[PDB]
């Protein structure tokens, strides 16, 4: 997964020249004839898109889920990211749509 190619539905909507709510509308109103052309996935409360068809979005997990998997407070990774960002150097992550995301692989790297 290339985390430089990861956007919210609103940002992806602008990236394809449409109003900010275009993909959110397509999702809410089940316009699959539209949705089928995109690489996207529901991840937590965000619909995440990539303009790269090869990005495996199933690798992306919320920092909240990652925190819970480690047996920590929901805000464990969010807290560390805010105050001590160097701790996530070498750890694949992205903050977008006011949400921190890690990957399945980078969670494993973090544990080591
Ligand atoms: Br916090
Ligand atoms: Br905080
Ligand atoms: Pt905090």
PDB file of N, CA and C and ligand atoms in Angstrom:
ATOM      1  N   UNK A   1       0.827  -1.195   0.000  1.00  0.00           N
ATOM      2  CA  UNK A   1       0.000   0.000   0.000  1.00  0.00           C
ATOM      3  C   UNK A   1       0.869   1.255   0.000  1.00  0.00           C
ATOM      4  N   UNK A   2       0.496   2.213  -0.842  1.00  0.00           N
ATOM      5  CA  UNK A   2       1.171   3.494  -0.927  1.00  0.00           C
ATOM      6  C   UNK A   2       0.319   4.565  -0.243  1.00  0.00           C
ATOM      7  N   UNK A   3       0.742   4.986   0.946  1.00  0.00           N
ATOM      8  CA  UNK A   3      -0.076   5.885   1.754  1.00  0.00           C
ATOM      9  C   UNK A   3      -0.086   7.328   1.243  1.00  0.00           C
ATOM     10  N   UNK A   4       0.693   7.630   0.207  1.00  0.00           N
ATOM     11  CA  UNK A   4       0.617   8.954  -0.416  1.00  0.00           C
ATOM     12  C   UNK A   4      -0.550   9.058  -1.395  1.00  0.00           C
ATOM     13  N   UNK A   5      -1.200   7.919  -1.646  1.00  0.00           N
ATOM     14  CA  UNK A   5      -2.323   7.825  -2.583  1.00  0.00           C
ATOM     15  C   UNK A   5      -3.622   7.459  -1.864  1.00  0.00           C
ATOM     16  N   UNK A   6      -3.777   7.962  -0.642  1.00  0.00           N
ATOM     17  CA  UNK A   6      -4.921   7.628   0.206  1.00  0.00           C
ATOM     18  C   UNK A   6      -5.696   8.894   0.555  1.00  0.00           C
ATOM     19  N   UNK A   7      -6.993   8.930   0.235  1.00  0.00           N
ATOM     20  CA  UNK A   7      -7.815  10.114   0.494  1.00  0.00           C
ATOM     21  C   UNK A   7      -9.199   9.769   1.020  1.00  0.00           C
ATOM     22  N   UNK A   8      -9.821  10.727   1.703  1.00  0.00           N
ATOM     23  CA  UNK A   8     -11.230  10.602   2.044  1.00  0.00           C
ATOM     24  C   UNK A   8     -12.078  10.701   0.786  1.00  0.00           C
ATOM     25  N   UNK A   9     -13.336  10.301   0.899  1.00  0.00           N
ATOM     26  CA  UNK A   9     -14.271  10.454  -0.203  1.00  0.00           C
ATOM     27  C   UNK A   9     -14.388  11.912  -0.657  1.00  0.00           C
ATOM     28  N   UNK A  10     -14.419  12.845   0.293  1.00  0.00           N
ATOM     29  CA  UNK A  10     -14.509  14.263  -0.077  1.00  0.00           C
ATOM     30  C   UNK A  10     -13.290  14.725  -0.881  1.00  0.00           C
ATOM     31  N   UNK A  11     -12.093  14.322  -0.462  1.00  0.00           N
ATOM     32  CA  UNK A  11     -10.905  14.746  -1.196  1.00  0.00           C
ATOM     33  C   UNK A  11     -10.847  14.067  -2.559  1.00  0.00           C
ATOM     34  N   UNK A  12     -11.126  12.764  -2.598  1.00  0.00           N
ATOM     35  CA  UNK A  12     -11.128  12.040  -3.859  1.00  0.00           C
ATOM     36  C   UNK A  12     -12.132  12.677  -4.827  1.00  0.00           C
ATOM     37  N   UNK A  13     -13.269  13.128  -4.299  1.00  0.00           N
ATOM     38  CA  UNK A  13     -14.303  13.772  -5.118  1.00  0.00           C
ATOM     39  C   UNK A  13     -13.744  14.989  -5.854  1.00  0.00           C
ATOM     40  N   UNK A  14     -12.985  15.814  -5.142  1.00  0.00           N
ATOM     41  CA  UNK A  14     -12.344  16.976  -5.760  1.00  0.00           C
ATOM     42  C   UNK A  14     -11.237  16.576  -6.726  1.00  0.00           C
ATOM     43  N   UNK A  15     -10.540  15.488  -6.413  1.00  0.00           N
ATOM     44  CA  UNK A  15      -9.467  14.994  -7.269  1.00  0.00           C
ATOM     45  C   UNK A  15      -9.982  14.526  -8.622  1.00  0.00           C
ATOM     46  N   UNK A  16     -11.259  14.167  -8.700  1.00  0.00           N
ATOM     47  CA  UNK A  16     -11.817  13.800  -9.998  1.00  0.00           C
ATOM     48  C   UNK A  16     -12.735  14.896 -10.552  1.00  0.00           C
ATOM     49  N   UNK A  17     -12.623  16.097  -9.996  1.00  0.00           N
ATOM     50  CA  UNK A  17     -13.241  17.278 -10.579  1.00  0.00           C
ATOM     51  C   UNK A  17     -14.701  17.474 -10.248  1.00  0.00           C
ATOM     52  N   UNK A  18     -15.154  16.836  -9.177  1.00  0.00           N
ATOM     53  CA  UNK A  18     -16.568  16.876  -8.826  1.00  0.00           C
ATOM     54  C   UNK A  18     -16.771  17.641  -7.540  1.00  0.00           C
ATOM     55  N   UNK A  19     -18.026  17.929  -7.207  1.00  0.00           N
ATOM     56  CA  UNK A  19     -18.319  18.592  -5.943  1.00  0.00           C
ATOM     57  C   UNK A  19     -17.874  17.712  -4.763  1.00  0.00           C
ATOM     58  N   UNK A  20     -17.564  18.319  -3.620  1.00  0.00           N
ATOM     59  CA  UNK A  20     -16.991  17.576  -2.485  1.00  0.00           C
ATOM     60  C   UNK A  20     -17.827  16.395  -1.982  1.00  0.00           C
ATOM     61  N   UNK A  21     -19.127  16.416  -2.252  1.00  0.00           N
ATOM     62  CA  UNK A  21     -20.016  15.374  -1.753  1.00  0.00           C
ATOM     63  C   UNK A  21     -20.346  14.301  -2.802  1.00  0.00           C
ATOM     64  N   UNK A  22     -19.680  14.344  -3.948  1.00  0.00           N
ATOM     65  CA  UNK A  22     -20.013  13.443  -5.057  1.00  0.00           C
ATOM     66  C   UNK A  22     -19.917  11.951  -4.701  1.00  0.00           C
ATOM     67  N   UNK A  23     -18.778  11.534  -4.165  1.00  0.00           N
ATOM     68  CA  UNK A  23     -18.594  10.116  -3.880  1.00  0.00           C
ATOM     69  C   UNK A  23     -19.370   9.699  -2.632  1.00  0.00           C
ATOM     70  N   UNK A  24     -19.519  10.627  -1.692  1.00  0.00           N
ATOM     71  CA  UNK A  24     -20.316  10.369  -0.500  1.00  0.00           C
ATOM     72  C   UNK A  24     -21.780  10.150  -0.882  1.00  0.00           C
ATOM     73  N   UNK A  25     -22.258  10.927  -1.844  1.00  0.00           N
ATOM     74  CA  UNK A  25     -23.605  10.723  -2.363  1.00  0.00           C
ATOM     75  C   UNK A  25     -23.738   9.386  -3.075  1.00  0.00           C
ATOM     76  N   UNK A  26     -22.746   9.055  -3.899  1.00  0.00           N
ATOM     77  CA  UNK A  26     -22.764   7.787  -4.627  1.00  0.00           C
ATOM     78  C   UNK A  26     -22.799   6.632  -3.638  1.00  0.00           C
ATOM     79  N   UNK A  27     -22.034   6.761  -2.558  1.00  0.00           N
ATOM     80  CA  UNK A  27     -22.007   5.729  -1.532  1.00  0.00           C
ATOM     81  C   UNK A  27     -23.340   5.646  -0.777  1.00  0.00           C
ATOM     82  N   UNK A  28     -23.820   6.777  -0.277  1.00  0.00           N
ATOM     83  CA  UNK A  28     -25.070   6.801   0.482  1.00  0.00           C
ATOM     84  C   UNK A  28     -26.245   6.285  -0.348  1.00  0.00           C
ATOM     85  N   UNK A  29     -26.286   6.680  -1.616  1.00  0.00           N
ATOM     86  CA  UNK A  29     -27.421   6.322  -2.470  1.00  0.00           C
ATOM     87  C   UNK A  29     -27.133   5.129  -3.374  1.00  0.00           C
ATOM     88  N   UNK A  30     -26.125   4.343  -2.992  1.00  0.00           N
ATOM     89  CA  UNK A  30     -25.831   3.053  -3.603  1.00  0.00           C
ATOM     90  C   UNK A  30     -25.690   3.103  -5.115  1.00  0.00           C
ATOM     91  N   UNK A  31     -25.049   4.158  -5.611  1.00  0.00           N
ATOM     92  CA  UNK A  31     -24.809   4.292  -7.048  1.00  0.00           C
ATOM     93  C   UNK A  31     -23.622   3.443  -7.475  1.00  0.00           C
ATOM     94  N   UNK A  32     -23.815   2.131  -7.519  1.00  0.00           N
ATOM     95  CA  UNK A  32     -22.687   1.242  -7.759  1.00  0.00           C
ATOM     96  C   UNK A  32     -22.144   1.341  -9.182  1.00  0.00           C
ATOM     97  N   UNK A  33     -22.963   1.811 -10.114  1.00  0.00           N
ATOM     98  CA  UNK A  33     -22.467   2.022 -11.476  1.00  0.00           C
ATOM     99  C   UNK A  33     -21.339   3.058 -11.463  1.00  0.00           C
ATOM    100  N   UNK A  34     -21.374   3.929 -10.460  1.00  0.00           N
ATOM    101  CA  UNK A  34     -20.333   4.928 -10.251  1.00  0.00           C
ATOM    102  C   UNK A  34     -19.221   4.352  -9.380  1.00  0.00           C
ATOM    103  N   UNK A  35     -19.609   3.741  -8.265  1.00  0.00           N
ATOM    104  CA  UNK A  35     -18.644   3.246  -7.293  1.00  0.00           C
ATOM    105  C   UNK A  35     -17.732   2.172  -7.865  1.00  0.00           C
ATOM    106  N   UNK A  36     -18.226   1.387  -8.822  1.00  0.00           N
ATOM    107  CA  UNK A  36     -17.456   0.249  -9.320  1.00  0.00           C
ATOM    108  C   UNK A  36     -16.155   0.652  -9.997  1.00  0.00           C
ATOM    109  N   UNK A  37     -16.043   1.915 -10.379  1.00  0.00           N
ATOM    110  CA  UNK A  37     -14.868   2.366 -11.109  1.00  0.00           C
ATOM    111  C   UNK A  37     -13.741   2.822 -10.200  1.00  0.00           C
ATOM    112  N   UNK A  38     -13.982   2.738  -8.897  1.00  0.00           N
ATOM    113  CA  UNK A  38     -13.038   3.276  -7.921  1.00  0.00           C
ATOM    114  C   UNK A  38     -12.488   2.224  -6.993  1.00  0.00           C
ATOM    115  N   UNK A  39     -11.291   2.500  -6.488  1.00  0.00           N
ATOM    116  CA  UNK A  39     -10.676   1.680  -5.468  1.00  0.00           C
ATOM    117  C   UNK A  39     -10.999   2.350  -4.141  1.00  0.00           C
ATOM    118  N   UNK A  40     -11.887   1.741  -3.361  1.00  0.00           N
ATOM    119  CA  UNK A  40     -12.314   2.349  -2.117  1.00  0.00           C
ATOM    120  C   UNK A  40     -12.676   1.279  -1.106  1.00  0.00           C
ATOM    121  N   UNK A  41     -12.801   1.691   0.143  1.00  0.00           N
ATOM    122  CA  UNK A  41     -13.154   0.757   1.202  1.00  0.00           C
ATOM    123  C   UNK A  41     -13.689   1.508   2.407  1.00  0.00           C
ATOM    124  N   UNK A  42     -14.688   0.955   3.082  1.00  0.00           N
ATOM    125  CA  UNK A  42     -15.067   1.529   4.364  1.00  0.00           C
ATOM    126  C   UNK A  42     -14.028   1.144   5.424  1.00  0.00           C
ATOM    127  N   UNK A  43     -13.452   2.140   6.095  1.00  0.00           N
ATOM    128  CA  UNK A  43     -12.465   1.891   7.158  1.00  0.00           C
ATOM    129  C   UNK A  43     -12.824   2.757   8.356  1.00  0.00           C
ATOM    130  N   UNK A  44     -13.334   2.126   9.407  1.00  0.00           N
ATOM    131  CA  UNK A  44     -13.915   2.873  10.506  1.00  0.00           C
ATOM    132  C   UNK A  44     -15.052   3.724   9.969  1.00  0.00           C
ATOM    133  N   UNK A  45     -15.145   4.961  10.438  1.00  0.00           N
ATOM    134  CA  UNK A  45     -16.198   5.850   9.975  1.00  0.00           C
ATOM    135  C   UNK A  45     -15.808   6.705   8.779  1.00  0.00           C
ATOM    136  N   UNK A  46     -14.812   6.259   8.021  1.00  0.00           N
ATOM    137  CA  UNK A  46     -14.359   6.997   6.841  1.00  0.00           C
ATOM    138  C   UNK A  46     -14.478   6.122   5.602  1.00  0.00           C
ATOM    139  N   UNK A  47     -14.957   6.671   4.483  1.00  0.00           N
ATOM    140  CA  UNK A  47     -14.841   5.922   3.227  1.00  0.00           C
ATOM    141  C   UNK A  47     -13.540   6.338   2.540  1.00  0.00           C
ATOM    142  N   UNK A  48     -12.580   5.425   2.498  1.00  0.00           N
ATOM    143  CA  UNK A  48     -11.259   5.737   1.960  1.00  0.00           C
ATOM    144  C   UNK A  48     -11.123   5.346   0.493  1.00  0.00           C
ATOM    145  N   UNK A  49     -10.536   6.242  -0.306  1.00  0.00           N
ATOM    146  CA  UNK A  49     -10.325   6.017  -1.732  1.00  0.00           C
ATOM    147  C   UNK A  49      -8.849   6.053  -2.093  1.00  0.00           C
ATOM    148  N   UNK A  50      -8.478   5.321  -3.136  1.00  0.00           N
ATOM    149  CA  UNK A  50      -7.176   5.532  -3.762  1.00  0.00           C
ATOM    150  C   UNK A  50      -7.342   5.684  -5.259  1.00  0.00           C
ATOM    151  N   UNK A  51      -6.543   6.559  -5.876  1.00  0.00           N
ATOM    152  CA  UNK A  51      -6.585   6.668  -7.331  1.00  0.00           C
ATOM    153  C   UNK A  51      -5.630   5.656  -7.964  1.00  0.00           C
ATOM    154  N   UNK A  52      -4.999   4.834  -7.129  1.00  0.00           N
ATOM    155  CA  UNK A  52      -4.187   3.730  -7.622  1.00  0.00           C
ATOM    156  C   UNK A  52      -4.895   2.403  -7.398  1.00  0.00           C
ATOM    157  N   UNK A  53      -5.331   1.746  -8.494  1.00  0.00           N
ATOM    158  CA  UNK A  53      -6.071   0.478  -8.425  1.00  0.00           C
ATOM    159  C   UNK A  53      -5.305  -0.626  -7.714  1.00  0.00           C
ATOM    160  N   UNK A  54      -3.988  -0.493  -7.651  1.00  0.00           N
ATOM    161  CA  UNK A  54      -3.158  -1.515  -7.042  1.00  0.00           C
ATOM    162  C   UNK A  54      -3.029  -1.391  -5.522  1.00  0.00           C
ATOM    163  N   UNK A  55      -3.436  -0.260  -4.962  1.00  0.00           N
ATOM    164  CA  UNK A  55      -3.382  -0.119  -3.511  1.00  0.00           C
ATOM    165  C   UNK A  55      -4.358  -1.065  -2.820  1.00  0.00           C
ATOM    166  N   UNK A  56      -3.832  -1.967  -1.997  1.00  0.00           N
ATOM    167  CA  UNK A  56      -4.674  -2.883  -1.246  1.00  0.00           C
ATOM    168  C   UNK A  56      -5.188  -2.214   0.029  1.00  0.00           C
ATOM    169  N   UNK A  57      -6.364  -1.610  -0.060  1.00  0.00           N
ATOM    170  CA  UNK A  57      -6.888  -0.826   1.046  1.00  0.00           C
ATOM    171  C   UNK A  57      -7.267  -1.685   2.241  1.00  0.00           C
ATOM    172  N   UNK A  58      -7.340  -3.006   2.052  1.00  0.00           N
ATOM    173  CA  UNK A  58      -7.633  -3.905   3.172  1.00  0.00           C
ATOM    174  C   UNK A  58      -6.478  -3.967   4.180  1.00  0.00           C
ATOM    175  N   UNK A  59      -5.333  -3.397   3.820  1.00  0.00           N
ATOM    176  CA  UNK A  59      -4.197  -3.318   4.737  1.00  0.00           C
ATOM    177  C   UNK A  59      -4.327  -2.173   5.733  1.00  0.00           C
ATOM    178  N   UNK A  60      -5.220  -1.237   5.440  1.00  0.00           N
ATOM    179  CA  UNK A  60      -5.354  -0.021   6.230  1.00  0.00           C
ATOM    180  C   UNK A  60      -6.269  -0.277   7.409  1.00  0.00           C
ATOM    181  N   UNK A  61      -5.839   0.140   8.596  1.00  0.00           N
ATOM    182  CA  UNK A  61      -6.630  -0.019   9.812  1.00  0.00           C
ATOM    183  C   UNK A  61      -6.614   1.303  10.572  1.00  0.00           C
ATOM    184  N   UNK A  62      -7.659   1.596  11.333  1.00  0.00           N
ATOM    185  CA  UNK A  62      -7.624   2.831  12.121  1.00  0.00           C
ATOM    186  C   UNK A  62      -6.606   2.695  13.252  1.00  0.00           C
ATOM    187  N   UNK A  63      -6.047   3.817  13.686  1.00  0.00           N
ATOM    188  CA  UNK A  63      -5.156   3.815  14.840  1.00  0.00           C
ATOM    189  C   UNK A  63      -5.895   3.375  16.102  1.00  0.00           C
ATOM    190  N   UNK A  64      -7.193   3.649  16.147  1.00  0.00           N
ATOM    191  CA  UNK A  64      -8.029   3.168  17.243  1.00  0.00           C
ATOM    192  C   UNK A  64      -8.046   1.642  17.284  1.00  0.00           C
ATOM    193  N   UNK A  65      -8.334   0.993  16.151  1.00  0.00           N
ATOM    194  CA  UNK A  65      -8.319  -0.480  16.130  1.00  0.00           C
ATOM    195  C   UNK A  65      -6.937  -1.002  16.498  1.00  0.00           C
ATOM    196  N   UNK A  66      -5.901  -0.371  15.949  1.00  0.00           N
ATOM    197  CA  UNK A  66      -4.536  -0.776  16.245  1.00  0.00           C
ATOM    198  C   UNK A  66      -4.235  -0.670  17.747  1.00  0.00           C
ATOM    199  N   UNK A  67      -4.645   0.436  18.366  1.00  0.00           N
ATOM    200  CA  UNK A  67      -4.527   0.614  19.811  1.00  0.00           C
ATOM    201  C   UNK A  67      -5.225  -0.521  20.575  1.00  0.00           C
ATOM    202  N   UNK A  68      -6.434  -0.867  20.144  1.00  0.00           N
ATOM    203  CA  UNK A  68      -7.205  -1.908  20.832  1.00  0.00           C
ATOM    204  C   UNK A  68      -6.551  -3.271  20.673  1.00  0.00           C
ATOM    205  N   UNK A  69      -6.038  -3.547  19.481  1.00  0.00           N
ATOM    206  CA  UNK A  69      -5.351  -4.812  19.229  1.00  0.00           C
ATOM    207  C   UNK A  69      -4.138  -4.990  20.145  1.00  0.00           C
ATOM    208  N   UNK A  70      -3.495  -3.879  20.517  1.00  0.00           N
ATOM    209  CA  UNK A  70      -2.333  -3.924  21.419  1.00  0.00           C
ATOM    210  C   UNK A  70      -2.721  -3.958  22.894  1.00  0.00           C
ATOM    211  N   UNK A  71      -4.021  -3.943  23.157  1.00  0.00           N
ATOM    212  CA  UNK A  71      -4.528  -3.949  24.513  1.00  0.00           C
ATOM    213  C   UNK A  71      -4.365  -2.605  25.203  1.00  0.00           C
ATOM    214  N   UNK A  72      -4.452  -1.529  24.421  1.00  0.00           N
ATOM    215  CA  UNK A  72      -4.278  -0.170  24.924  1.00  0.00           C
ATOM    216  C   UNK A  72      -5.565   0.645  24.817  1.00  0.00           C
ATOM    217  N   UNK A  73      -5.547   1.825  25.427  1.00  0.00           N
ATOM    218  CA  UNK A  73      -6.623   2.814  25.338  1.00  0.00           C
ATOM    219  C   UNK A  73      -6.901   3.176  23.885  1.00  0.00           C
ATOM    220  N   UNK A  74      -8.161   3.463  23.539  1.00  0.00           N
ATOM    221  CA  UNK A  74      -8.517   3.773  22.143  1.00  0.00           C
ATOM    222  C   UNK A  74      -7.612   4.847  21.547  1.00  0.00           C
ATOM    223  N   UNK A  75      -7.179   5.786  22.388  1.00  0.00           N
ATOM    224  CA  UNK A  75      -6.417   6.940  21.910  1.00  0.00           C
ATOM    225  C   UNK A  75      -4.903   6.764  22.023  1.00  0.00           C
ATOM    226  N   UNK A  76      -4.451   5.539  22.267  1.00  0.00           N
ATOM    227  CA  UNK A  76      -3.026   5.263  22.463  1.00  0.00           C
ATOM    228  C   UNK A  76      -2.143   5.774  21.309  1.00  0.00           C
ATOM    229  N   UNK A  77      -2.434   5.348  20.088  1.00  0.00           N
ATOM    230  CA  UNK A  77      -1.637   5.776  18.937  1.00  0.00           C
ATOM    231  C   UNK A  77      -1.846   7.246  18.582  1.00  0.00           C
ATOM    232  N   UNK A  78      -3.083   7.721  18.702  1.00  0.00           N
ATOM    233  CA  UNK A  78      -3.386   9.128  18.457  1.00  0.00           C
ATOM    234  C   UNK A  78      -2.572  10.019  19.400  1.00  0.00           C
ATOM    235  N   UNK A  79      -2.490   9.603  20.660  1.00  0.00           N
ATOM    236  CA  UNK A  79      -1.747  10.338  21.685  1.00  0.00           C
ATOM    237  C   UNK A  79      -0.248  10.375  21.395  1.00  0.00           C
ATOM    238  N   UNK A  80       0.308   9.228  21.016  1.00  0.00           N
ATOM    239  CA  UNK A  80       1.729   9.122  20.718  1.00  0.00           C
ATOM    240  C   UNK A  80       2.067   9.913  19.460  1.00  0.00           C
ATOM    241  N   UNK A  81       1.236   9.765  18.439  1.00  0.00           N
ATOM    242  CA  UNK A  81       1.421  10.503  17.193  1.00  0.00           C
ATOM    243  C   UNK A  81       1.444  12.017  17.399  1.00  0.00           C
ATOM    244  N   UNK A  82       0.576  12.505  18.276  1.00  0.00           N
ATOM    245  CA  UNK A  82       0.514  13.931  18.531  1.00  0.00           C
ATOM    246  C   UNK A  82       1.718  14.433  19.312  1.00  0.00           C
ATOM    247  N   UNK A  83       2.087  13.724  20.374  1.00  0.00           N
ATOM    248  CA  UNK A  83       3.121  14.227  21.286  1.00  0.00           C
ATOM    249  C   UNK A  83       4.539  13.749  20.966  1.00  0.00           C
ATOM    250  N   UNK A  84       4.656  12.541  20.421  1.00  0.00           N
ATOM    251  CA  UNK A  84       5.964  11.925  20.203  1.00  0.00           C
ATOM    252  C   UNK A  84       6.021  11.269  18.823  1.00  0.00           C
ATOM    253  N   UNK A  85       5.871  12.075  17.762  1.00  0.00           N
ATOM    254  CA  UNK A  85       5.729  11.503  16.414  1.00  0.00           C
ATOM    255  C   UNK A  85       6.925  10.663  15.961  1.00  0.00           C
ATOM    256  N   UNK A  86       8.115  10.916  16.496  1.00  0.00           N
ATOM    257  CA  UNK A  86       9.289  10.117  16.149  1.00  0.00           C
ATOM    258  C   UNK A  86       9.076   8.630  16.430  1.00  0.00           C
ATOM    259  N   UNK A  87       8.157   8.310  17.345  1.00  0.00           N
ATOM    260  CA  UNK A  87       7.907   6.912  17.694  1.00  0.00           C
ATOM    261  C   UNK A  87       7.281   6.132  16.550  1.00  0.00           C
ATOM    262  N   UNK A  88       6.732   6.861  15.583  1.00  0.00           N
ATOM    263  CA  UNK A  88       6.121   6.253  14.419  1.00  0.00           C
ATOM    264  C   UNK A  88       7.005   6.407  13.189  1.00  0.00           C
ATOM    265  N   UNK A  89       8.249   6.837  13.380  1.00  0.00           N
ATOM    266  CA  UNK A  89       9.182   6.814  12.261  1.00  0.00           C
ATOM    267  C   UNK A  89       9.449   5.338  11.936  1.00  0.00           C
ATOM    268  N   UNK A  90       9.452   5.008  10.652  1.00  0.00           N
ATOM    269  CA  UNK A  90       9.609   3.626  10.241  1.00  0.00           C
ATOM    270  C   UNK A  90       8.300   2.863  10.297  1.00  0.00           C
ATOM    271  N   UNK A  91       7.269   3.513  10.831  1.00  0.00           N
ATOM    272  CA  UNK A  91       5.942   2.912  10.949  1.00  0.00           C
ATOM    273  C   UNK A  91       4.993   3.572   9.965  1.00  0.00           C
ATOM    274  N   UNK A  92       4.596   2.836   8.926  1.00  0.00           N
ATOM    275  CA  UNK A  92       3.678   3.360   7.913  1.00  0.00           C
ATOM    276  C   UNK A  92       2.378   3.850   8.541  1.00  0.00           C
ATOM    277  N   UNK A  93       2.029   5.105   8.275  1.00  0.00           N
ATOM    278  CA  UNK A  93       0.811   5.684   8.828  1.00  0.00           C
ATOM    279  C   UNK A  93       0.359   6.850   7.978  1.00  0.00           C
ATOM    280  N   UNK A  94      -0.905   7.230   8.118  1.00  0.00           N
ATOM    281  CA  UNK A  94      -1.414   8.414   7.440  1.00  0.00           C
ATOM    282  C   UNK A  94      -2.532   9.010   8.276  1.00  0.00           C
ATOM    283  N   UNK A  95      -2.539  10.330   8.370  1.00  0.00           N
ATOM    284  CA  UNK A  95      -3.619  11.054   9.019  1.00  0.00           C
ATOM    285  C   UNK A  95      -4.413  11.751   7.931  1.00  0.00           C
ATOM    286  N   UNK A  96      -5.683  11.395   7.775  1.00  0.00           N
ATOM    287  CA  UNK A  96      -6.520  12.117   6.836  1.00  0.00           C
ATOM    288  C   UNK A  96      -7.956  11.976   7.297  1.00  0.00           C
ATOM    289  N   UNK A  97      -8.811  12.926   6.923  1.00  0.00           N
ATOM    290  CA  UNK A  97     -10.175  12.921   7.438  1.00  0.00           C
ATOM    291  C   UNK A  97     -10.217  12.914   8.963  1.00  0.00           C
ATOM    292  N   UNK A  98      -9.293  13.670   9.552  1.00  0.00           N
ATOM    293  CA  UNK A  98      -9.166  13.848  10.993  1.00  0.00           C
ATOM    294  C   UNK A  98      -9.050  12.521  11.715  1.00  0.00           C
ATOM    295  N   UNK A  99      -8.405  11.566  11.057  1.00  0.00           N
ATOM    296  CA  UNK A  99      -8.278  10.211  11.586  1.00  0.00           C
ATOM    297  C   UNK A  99      -6.890   9.658  11.312  1.00  0.00           C
ATOM    298  N   UNK A 100      -6.263   9.074  12.332  1.00  0.00           N
ATOM    299  CA  UNK A 100      -4.984   8.406  12.126  1.00  0.00           C
ATOM    300  C   UNK A 100      -5.206   6.942  11.731  1.00  0.00           C
ATOM    301  N   UNK A 101      -4.494   6.521  10.687  1.00  0.00           N
ATOM    302  CA  UNK A 101      -4.511   5.148  10.179  1.00  0.00           C
ATOM    303  C   UNK A 101      -3.120   4.543  10.214  1.00  0.00           C
ATOM    304  N   UNK A 102      -3.024   3.271  10.589  1.00  0.00           N
ATOM    305  CA  UNK A 102      -1.803   2.486  10.387  1.00  0.00           C
ATOM    306  C   UNK A 102      -2.075   1.391   9.353  1.00  0.00           C
ATOM    307  N   UNK A 103      -1.099   0.526   9.102  1.00  0.00           N
ATOM    308  CA  UNK A 103      -1.365  -0.642   8.270  1.00  0.00           C
ATOM    309  C   UNK A 103      -1.185  -1.887   9.106  1.00  0.00           C
ATOM    310  N   UNK A 104      -1.684  -3.011   8.612  1.00  0.00           N
ATOM    311  CA  UNK A 104      -1.523  -4.263   9.326  1.00  0.00           C
ATOM    312  C   UNK A 104      -0.041  -4.572   9.513  1.00  0.00           C
ATOM    313  N   UNK A 105       0.733  -4.370   8.453  1.00  0.00           N
ATOM    314  CA  UNK A 105       2.164  -4.634   8.496  1.00  0.00           C
ATOM    315  C   UNK A 105       2.875  -3.672   9.437  1.00  0.00           C
ATOM    316  N   UNK A 106       2.482  -2.400   9.438  1.00  0.00           N
ATOM    317  CA  UNK A 106       3.245  -1.444  10.243  1.00  0.00           C
ATOM    318  C   UNK A 106       2.926  -1.641  11.723  1.00  0.00           C
ATOM    319  N   UNK A 107       1.739  -2.149  12.033  1.00  0.00           N
ATOM    320  CA  UNK A 107       1.438  -2.499  13.416  1.00  0.00           C
ATOM    321  C   UNK A 107       2.390  -3.598  13.892  1.00  0.00           C
ATOM    322  N   UNK A 108       2.694  -4.539  13.004  1.00  0.00           N
ATOM    323  CA  UNK A 108       3.626  -5.611  13.339  1.00  0.00           C
ATOM    324  C   UNK A 108       5.037  -5.070  13.531  1.00  0.00           C
ATOM    325  N   UNK A 109       5.440  -4.141  12.669  1.00  0.00           N
ATOM    326  CA  UNK A 109       6.742  -3.490  12.805  1.00  0.00           C
ATOM    327  C   UNK A 109       6.833  -2.764  14.140  1.00  0.00           C
ATOM    328  N   UNK A 110       5.757  -2.072  14.500  1.00  0.00           N
ATOM    329  CA  UNK A 110       5.717  -1.336  15.753  1.00  0.00           C
ATOM    330  C   UNK A 110       5.940  -2.241  16.956  1.00  0.00           C
ATOM    331  N   UNK A 111       5.379  -3.445  16.909  1.00  0.00           N
ATOM    332  CA  UNK A 111       5.507  -4.382  18.026  1.00  0.00           C
ATOM    333  C   UNK A 111       6.939  -4.895  18.215  1.00  0.00           C
ATOM    334  N   UNK A 112       7.776  -4.714  17.199  1.00  0.00           N
ATOM    335  CA  UNK A 112       9.143  -5.233  17.226  1.00  0.00           C
ATOM    336  C   UNK A 112      10.193  -4.152  17.477  1.00  0.00           C
TER     337      UNK A 112
HETATM  338 BR1  LIG B   1      -4.861  11.556  23.937  1.00  0.00          BR
HETATM  339 BR1  LIG B   2      -4.998  14.083  22.243  1.00  0.00          BR
HETATM  340 PT1  LIG B   3      -3.536  12.681  23.694  1.00  0.00          PT
END
